[PDB]
Write a protein that binds this ligand. Structure first.
Ligand code: COA
Ligand code: ZN
Ligand code: ZN
Ligand code: ZN
Ligand code: ZN
Length: 532
């Protein structure tokens, strides 16, 4: 196994100890919590013959101090890997309630507190030992990268490096201004996703909502429609043999589905904090589904800054969505406000351990004050739950109720043919909403084919495989980084560009610095234009 890197950062024993040991000391100073840790665990004093079958690499403060004093640590990470072995062996063996389990956790908050600054002035990211959350005995570790010039290993996720964005390799931040060089731009930003009129309207609406509230920690929001697709929902076999064999409802029903996410700039980087999937049923779609939209799935990560503005802006996206489709020509909208089943993640792969899933009535109340704000806003002009709507509209037939993809009702009907049914309605009135908004519908936005976002399953599976967890602010940033690379670079659309005055095909063109998608010929406008 041949190796090389020539201007390595190597640490000689006592420069390490001069930096590292103040941290060991802070552990030792913790009294009594330190005491079961100043010595190697001795199962014959303690009375635990199982120990060495359980913890197969014992570690303790004294061993660490010996390695430090004698110089057996070449790089600081070996140091910090060794104390976390100490902690991890304790949390393993001992019961979550035992005393030394508790001792241990206190040494660890102390060590976290002390280790990060020193590892940082030694030019590393943190002093932590990170493993991804358990999958379907053992856990996967966070990735590292090596500065091409230091050689000093850093958490990939900490320093947010990805070779696709910077193919020349990773180089650290201090060596970078040693280089006189700043880091090249991450072109694969939320802002730089193709923009759409739908995405713009939601984007434009909320950020000067935020402007009106004007809290200092808030950053820019970007709303992007990352997929758009023409599908049709087939009538499930029972109801179709009973109704379209008859000729009373159509076999298929066309709809356009859109997936659209919302990003905020946090610490200088895009964080994805909201995502949604709609089904839009146009004006050519036969009854019962003509001119209506349906909010399939809605999902969220709580790292929007500030949290007090957080919920309001979710509402601003939703209400802004209905505002948009209204004017296009839609007339009614439909929310199935059903809260998650089973730690079911709707769109984002590993939610924060401490962002709790709501009970259904929380979620209904939520959606209800959602709609009240828009009613007051003169956006929606009325809304009711499904029975004040259904029996107020006098419906007696199963053909009369909108029939959506993946929706509850197609499948309550579908198995109800062998076996009563207005009652199966009456139970669940509070979970389904009917939104009254009020000349063919035509969508200005082009179709975006993105297989990763066609339906919610592709993004989730890819995230499981790539460990793009949304479970911490630092992981969401990294998961957002790579989500954005997937959208930018493995979308399915090729672009043919055309001149905005003559409609002609173009290769060379003069790109406005001004308009969001504008490109004049050479056969030539008001604005400064560059050649693209
Ligand atoms: C719907 C959603 C986007 C709205 O998020 P939100 O605006 O942050 O509000 P929530 O309904 O989560 O809860 C708001 C408050 O209630 C608390 N809370 C939420 N669920 C709770 C529960 N079941 N029990 C107790 N408290 C709860 C939260 O802590 C928060 O209060 P706080 O800041 O004082 O701590 C969010 O619930 C979400 O991401 N859901 C994912 C799955 C889901 O519910 N999908 C529904 C699609 S129809
Ligand atoms: Zn780190
Ligand atoms: Zn470096
Ligand atoms: Zn212009
Ligand atoms: Zn021209």
């Amino acid at each position: 196994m041949g190796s090389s890197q020539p201007r390595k950062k190597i640490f000689k024993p006592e420069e390490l100890r001069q930096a590292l040991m103040p941290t060991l000391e802070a552990l030792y100073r913790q009294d009594p919590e330190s005491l079961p840790f100043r010595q190697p665990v001795d199962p014959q004093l303690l009375g635990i013959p199982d120990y060495f079958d359980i913890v197969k690499n014992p570690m303790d403060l004294s061993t660490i101090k010996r390695k430090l004093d004698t110089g057996q640590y070449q790089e600081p990470w070996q140091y910090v890997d060794d104390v976390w072995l100490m902690f991890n062996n304790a949390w393993l063996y001992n019961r979550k309630t035992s005393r030394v389990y508790k001792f241990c956790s206190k040494l660890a908050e102390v060590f976290e507190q002390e280790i990060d600054p020193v590892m940082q002035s030694l030019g590393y990211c943190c002093g932590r030992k990170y493993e991804f959350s358990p999958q379907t005995d053992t856990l996967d570790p966070e990735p590292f990268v090596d500065c091409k010039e230091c050689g000093r290993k850093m958490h990939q996720i900490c320093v947010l490096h990805y070779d696709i964005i910077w193919p020349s390799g990773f180089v650290c931040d201090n060596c970078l201004k040693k280089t006189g060089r700043p880091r090249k731009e991450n072109k694969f930003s939320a802002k730089r996703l193709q923009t759409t009129r739908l995405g713009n309207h939601l984007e434009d609406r909320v950020n000067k909502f935020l402007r009106r509230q004007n809290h200092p920690e808030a950053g820019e929001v970007f709303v992007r429609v990352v997929a758009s697709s023409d599908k049709t929902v087939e009538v499930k076999p029972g109801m179709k043999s009973r109704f379209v064999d008859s000729g009373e409802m159509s076999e298929s029903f066309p709809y356009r589905t859109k997936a659209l996410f919302a990003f905020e700039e946090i610490d200088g980087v895009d964080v994805c904090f909201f995502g949604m999937h709609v089904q839009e049923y146009g004006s050519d779609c036969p009854p019962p589904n003509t001119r209506r939209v349906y909010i399939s799935y809605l999902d969220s990560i709580h790292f929007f800054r500030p949290r007090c503005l957080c919920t309001a802006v979710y509402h601003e996206i939703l209400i802004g969505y209905l505002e948009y489709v209204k004017k296009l020509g839609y007339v009614t909208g439909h929310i199935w406000a059903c809260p998650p089943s089973e730690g079911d993640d709707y769109i984002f792969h590993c939610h924060p351990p401490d962002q709790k899933i709501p009970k259904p009535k929380r979620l209904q109340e939520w959606f209800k004050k959602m709609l009240d704000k828009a009613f007051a806003e003169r956006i929606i002009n009325d809304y009711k739950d499904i029975f004040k709507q259904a029996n107020e509209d006098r419906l007696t037939s199963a053909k009369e109720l909108p029939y959506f993809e993946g929706d509850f009702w197609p499948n309550v009907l579908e198995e109800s043919i062998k076996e009563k049914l207005y009652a199966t309605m009456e139970k669940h009135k509070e979970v389904f909403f009917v939104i009254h908004l009020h000349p063919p519908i035509v969508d200005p936005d082009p179709l975006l084919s993105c297989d990763l976002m066609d339906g919610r399953d592709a993004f989730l599976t890819l995230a499981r495989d790539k460990h793009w967890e949304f479970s911490s602010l630092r992981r969401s940033k990294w998961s957002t980084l790579c989500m954005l690379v997937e959208l930018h670079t493995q979308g399915q659309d090729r672009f043919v560009y055309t001149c905005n005055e003559c409609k002609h095909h173009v290769e060379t063109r003069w790109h406005c610095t001004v308009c969001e998608d504008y490109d004049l010929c050479i056969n030539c406008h008001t604005h400064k234009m560059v050649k693209w």
